Write a protein that holds these residues in place. Structure first.
Motif, PDB file in Angstrom:
ATOM      1  N   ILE A 211     -17.245   4.618   6.628  1.00  0.00           N
ATOM      2  CA  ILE A 211     -15.895   4.150   6.511  1.00  0.00           C
ATOM      3  C   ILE A 211     -15.033   5.147   7.215  1.00  0.00           C
ATOM      4  O   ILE A 211     -15.223   6.367   7.091  1.00  0.00           O
ATOM      5  CB  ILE A 211     -15.452   3.895   5.093  1.00  0.00           C
ATOM      6  N   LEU A 212     -14.127   4.597   8.008  1.00  0.00           N
ATOM      7  CA  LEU A 212     -13.232   5.374   8.826  1.00  0.00           C
ATOM      8  C   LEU A 212     -11.943   5.495   8.030  1.00  0.00           C
ATOM      9  O   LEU A 212     -11.000   4.741   8.205  1.00  0.00           O
ATOM     10  CB  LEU A 212     -13.046   4.699  10.192  1.00  0.00           C
ATOM     11  N   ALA A 213     -11.959   6.433   7.099  1.00  0.00           N
ATOM     12  CA  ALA A 213     -10.800   6.739   6.308  1.00  0.00           C
ATOM     13  C   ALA A 213      -9.768   7.440   7.171  1.00  0.00           C
ATOM     14  O   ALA A 213     -10.109   8.143   8.126  1.00  0.00           O
ATOM     15  CB  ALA A 213     -11.195   7.638   5.143  1.00  0.00           C
ATOM     16  N   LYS A 214      -8.500   7.228   6.831  1.00  0.00           N
ATOM     17  CA  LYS A 214      -7.450   8.154   7.216  1.00  0.00           C
ATOM     18  C   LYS A 214      -7.887   9.464   6.558  1.00  0.00           C
ATOM     19  O   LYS A 214      -8.372   9.459   5.415  1.00  0.00           O
ATOM     20  CB  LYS A 214      -6.102   7.707   6.668  1.00  0.00           C
TER      21      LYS A 214
ATOM     22  N   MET B  86      -6.741  12.114   4.985  1.00  0.00           N
ATOM     23  CA  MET B  86      -6.407  12.554   3.632  1.00  0.00           C
ATOM     24  C   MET B  86      -7.226  11.792   2.588  1.00  0.00           C
ATOM     25  O   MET B  86      -7.456  12.287   1.485  1.00  0.00           O
ATOM     26  CB  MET B  86      -4.923  12.408   3.352  1.00  0.00           C
ATOM     27  N   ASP B  87      -7.686  10.600   2.945  1.00  0.00           N
ATOM     28  CA  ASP B  87      -8.393   9.742   2.006  1.00  0.00           C
ATOM     29  C   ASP B  87      -9.887  10.024   1.934  1.00  0.00           C
ATOM     30  O   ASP B  87     -10.570   9.613   0.998  1.00  0.00           O
ATOM     31  CB  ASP B  87      -8.213   8.296   2.427  1.00  0.00           C
TER      32      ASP B  87
ATOM     33  N   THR C 153     -10.856  11.002  -1.283  1.00  0.00           N
ATOM     34  CA  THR C 153     -10.651   9.843  -2.160  1.00  0.00           C
ATOM     35  C   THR C 153     -11.931   8.999  -2.221  1.00  0.00           C
ATOM     36  O   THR C 153     -12.633   8.963  -3.240  1.00  0.00           O
ATOM     37  CB  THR C 153      -9.527   8.952  -1.675  1.00  0.00           C
ATOM     38  N   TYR C 154     -12.267   8.368  -1.106  1.00  0.00           N
ATOM     39  CA  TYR C 154     -13.358   7.445  -1.122  1.00  0.00           C
ATOM     40  C   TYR C 154     -14.562   8.137  -1.719  1.00  0.00           C
ATOM     41  O   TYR C 154     -15.174   7.645  -2.678  1.00  0.00           O
ATOM     42  CB  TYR C 154     -13.645   6.946   0.278  1.00  0.00           C
TER      43      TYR C 154
ATOM     44  N   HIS D  18     -14.575   8.636  -5.473  1.00  0.00           N
ATOM     45  CA  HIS D  18     -14.881   7.428  -6.222  1.00  0.00           C
ATOM     46  C   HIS D  18     -16.280   6.880  -5.925  1.00  0.00           C
ATOM     47  O   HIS D  18     -16.737   5.945  -6.569  1.00  0.00           O
ATOM     48  CB  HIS D  18     -13.805   6.390  -5.935  1.00  0.00           C
TER      49      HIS D  18
ATOM     50  N   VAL E  13     -17.131   5.348  -3.428  1.00  0.00           N
ATOM     51  CA  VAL E  13     -17.027   4.235  -2.527  1.00  0.00           C
ATOM     52  C   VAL E  13     -17.756   4.689  -1.263  1.00  0.00           C
ATOM     53  O   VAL E  13     -18.498   3.914  -0.647  1.00  0.00           O
ATOM     54  CB  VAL E  13     -15.567   3.853  -2.314  1.00  0.00           C
TER      55      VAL E  13
ATOM     56  N   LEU F  64      -3.399   6.318  -1.564  1.00  0.00           N
ATOM     57  CA  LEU F  64      -4.203   6.185  -0.359  1.00  0.00           C
ATOM     58  C   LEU F  64      -3.202   6.369   0.779  1.00  0.00           C
ATOM     59  O   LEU F  64      -2.052   5.922   0.671  1.00  0.00           O
ATOM     60  CB  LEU F  64      -4.889   4.814  -0.342  1.00  0.00           C
TER      61      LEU F  64
ATOM     62  N   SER G  16      -5.017   2.603   5.840  1.00  0.00           N
ATOM     63  CA  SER G  16      -6.203   1.766   5.845  1.00  0.00           C
ATOM     64  C   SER G  16      -6.424   1.188   4.448  1.00  0.00           C
ATOM     65  O   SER G  16      -7.504   1.332   3.867  1.00  0.00           O
ATOM     66  CB  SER G  16      -7.420   2.605   6.276  1.00  0.00           C
TER      67      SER G  16
ATOM     68  N   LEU H 197      -8.986  -1.398   3.557  1.00  0.00           N
ATOM     69  CA  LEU H 197     -10.309  -0.862   3.344  1.00  0.00           C
ATOM     70  C   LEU H 197     -10.638  -0.830   1.860  1.00  0.00           C
ATOM     71  O   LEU H 197     -11.745  -1.186   1.465  1.00  0.00           O
ATOM     72  CB  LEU H 197     -10.404   0.546   3.933  1.00  0.00           C
TER      73      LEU H 197
ATOM     74  N   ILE I  42     -14.337  -2.052   0.517  1.00  0.00           N
ATOM     75  CA  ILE I  42     -15.433  -1.315  -0.136  1.00  0.00           C
ATOM     76  C   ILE I  42     -15.239  -1.064  -1.614  1.00  0.00           C
ATOM     77  O   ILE I  42     -15.920  -0.243  -2.210  1.00  0.00           O
ATOM     78  CB  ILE I  42     -15.745   0.020   0.510  1.00  0.00           C
TER      79      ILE I  42
END
Lengths: 212, 212
Positions: A52-55, A57-58, A61-62, A65, A67, B139, B142, B145, B149
């Motif tokens: 997953i291509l998070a921003k 800062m996230d 986050t992902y 969790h 995710v 967040l 994105s 997203l 997910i």
């Protein structure tokens, strides 16, 4: 159809390319223009991964969790504050850092010396520990702009490190954090995927540590 | 060389174009591809203006500090919280709104129903006043997203209003705020430029109110 996938969060920031490279180097057959991929969630079936291509800062986050099981946490994330993820491995391949910078031959304000930054969190703490009664202004982007129109004579922000004149046409005033990306892992994920995950950790750190 | 300029903050968001249009319509001779301008701070000498192309959450910021005298405050800004700027004039030309949305035929989580959003502030308050023990995850981008997910089955976020299926390929679950941009003015600025500023306010509201 369902099974043994590994969801890796990547920061879509500058680091994306260098983060991507680590893997390529750490031997994960990513598709060619993965690096320019517009998509937010790209799959590498052949190498077990889903990104997953998070921003940036996230990314944590992902990962936090689960995710994403695993993150390349362009430390921008870990600028936020203290939080839950194993910080498995610095990738001080993906270099650059956090600084107080401002415009070339302009000094601090006499009154109400001020900072524009995306990161009140850190800047505030920095000046909250440095002793300066400063004036911090959370800004959501276009931070070069701040000094240019004098919102604040000084941004607290991420720039390259090498030398004193940032990409921005700005100039580093007072370094604060060096920051490393790090390969981070979701702990509940890691319990279940220690295999791929250690394997990755090892695989990465050789790419990282080794060549330097 | 120095004098009677008027620095207008514009949100570089979607609204930029429609914000730009209001002016064009309100009779401010902006240069042709102002609208696609990459620059952060563009000047219209002939019409007395200097624009700063703020990221839309910042527009007020700049205006609040009088770095810009005047803002087209794509209310995204005024989502932040309560703050200092005269909200001169709604431009419910620049339409769209804030919603709880999520993916098509997926309902809320049984346990730990959760929201990804850029706006914990509002979402939190919304569910903090709606009664839901919900789980909000700030967040930074994105947000499509998130549900994809499953970070969270529901984003709290800005989308169009018209009908129930957002641009995202998402679907509005529970509307919350309508939001209007508004022409905002820095009060200390306004004291000094009431002329141009009223003139603008009037000029805009005719463009706005009139045609509808």
């Amino acid at each position: 159809a369902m099974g043994k996938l590994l969801t890796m969060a990547m920061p879509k920031g500058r680091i994306f390319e260098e983060a991507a490279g680590l893997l390529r180097q750490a031997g994960y057959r990513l598709p060619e223009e993965f690096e320019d991929s517009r998509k937010l969630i790209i799959d590498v079936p052949e190498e077990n991964l889903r990104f997953i291509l998070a921003k940036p800062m996230d990314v944590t986050t992902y990962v936090e969790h689960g995710v994403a099981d695993v993150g390349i946490a362009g430390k921008d994330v870990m600028l936020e504050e203290e939080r839950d993820v194993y910080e498995v491995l610095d990738l001080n391949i993906s270099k650059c850092h956090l600084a107080v910078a401002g415009l070339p031959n302009t000094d601090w304000s006499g009154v109400a010396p001020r900072i524009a930054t995306k990161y009140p969190n850190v800047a505030s703490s920095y000046f909250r520990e440095q002793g300066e009664q400063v004036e911090i202004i959370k800004l959501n982007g276009s931070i070069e702009l701040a000094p240019l129109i004098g919102l604040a004579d000084r941004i607290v922000d991420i720039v390259s490190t090498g030398q004193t004149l940032k990409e921005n046409g700005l100039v580093e005033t007072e370094h604060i954090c060096d920051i490393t990306s790090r390969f981070i892992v979701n702990p509940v994920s890691y319990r279940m995927k220690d295999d791929v995950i250690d394997e990755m950790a090892s695989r990465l750190s050789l790419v990282v540590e080794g060549e330097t």
